Amino acid sequence: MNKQIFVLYFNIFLIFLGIGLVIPVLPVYLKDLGLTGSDLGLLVAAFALSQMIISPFGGTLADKLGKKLIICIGLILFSVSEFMFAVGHNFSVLMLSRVIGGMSAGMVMPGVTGLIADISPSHQKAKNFGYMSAIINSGFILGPGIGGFMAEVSHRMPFYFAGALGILAFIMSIVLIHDPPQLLTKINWKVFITPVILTLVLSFGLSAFETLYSLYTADKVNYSPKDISIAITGGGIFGALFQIYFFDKFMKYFSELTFIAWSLLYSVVVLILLVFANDYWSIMLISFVVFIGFDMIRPAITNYFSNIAGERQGFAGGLNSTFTSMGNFIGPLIAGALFDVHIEAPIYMAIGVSLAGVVIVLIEKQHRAK
C-alpha cells in the first residue's frame, strides 16, 4: 500500500484516540475538585457535538480551498486543542478545549475521506471503507487503553503525549503527502432507515458503556487507572482477534440480521452478568466478553450499507459517519445524568438500547420476510 494511505488512516486513528482519551481519568479528574457526572458526560458530548456542527462547513471549505491544507490546519488545531486540555484547571477551559478538539476532528475528517476517495478507484471503494471502519473502531477502543497506562506516572501528560503525537502526524502528513445537489430528491430513504438506526444503536451502546464503565468500576471496586487501562485493552484485543479470526466462519451459517440479533443478545446478557459481578478479577474477565460482543455488529452494519447502497458508496459512508457521531454525542450525555440519578442506571439504559435494537432487527426482518 502507498504510505500516503497509511498516513491518511493514521490521522483517523489519532482523531479517534483523542475522542477516547479522557475516559480513564474521567472520575479522578472531576471527583477530586468537586464536579458531578452530568458534566463528565457533557465533556465528550461537547466533543462529538462540535464534530457534528463543524463537519459540513469544514467539508465545504476543504472542497473549495483544498484537502491537504485543510488536513494540516486541522491537525495543528487538534494538537493545540489537546495541549490546552492538559493545562486547564477549571471546567470552562476544559469545555473550550473539547469544543476546539471537536472542531479540529470535524474539519479533519472530510479532507481525509475526500483524499482517500480521490486515491482509490471504483474497485477499492469498499475495501478502503472497511479499513476506515476498522481503524475508527480500533482507535475508539484503544483510546482509553493507552490513556490509562501512562496516566499512572506524571498524571497530566496523556494529552501532552497526544499533543506530541498530533504534531508528529502534522509534520509527517505535510511532508509525505504528494498532493499539490438534487441527488437526495430521487432517494426514497425507505430502506436506509434500519441500518441508520442500527449504527445509531451501536454507537450509543459502545460510547455509553465506555463512559459508564470507568465511573462504575472506580466507584464500586475502586479501580486505579491502570486497572481500567488493562481491562479496556484486553477487551479490545480479544474482540478484534475474535472478529478477524472467526467472522468468515460465522457468515457461512447465518444471515446478517440474525447474526446482529444474536450478537445483541450476547451483549445484553454479558451486561447483566457484569451488573451482578462484584469482584476485581470477575469484572476484569467480563470486559473481554463484553467487547467481543460489541466488536461483531459494526462490520455487519458496514456490509449491510455496502450491499444496499450499490453504486453510490459515498452516500452510505457519509450516513454511517454522521450517525456514528450522533451516537457518540447522545450516549455519554445521557450516561452522565443517569450515573448522577443512580449508580446502576447507565447499564439499565444500555440494556434498553440493546433490546431496542433487537426489536427493530426483528421487525425489519419480519416485514422483509412477509
Binding site: 467539508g59 476543504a62 475526500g114 480521490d118 450516513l319
Partner: peptide, 15 residues
C-alpha cells in the same frame, strides 16, 4: 473531469 465534490456530509464523484 475525475474530481470529487463535497455535498453535505459526503463526497460524490463527478460524472
Amino acid at each position: 473531469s475525475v474530481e470529487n465534490h463535497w455535498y453535505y456530509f459526503y463526497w460524490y464523484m463527478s460524472p
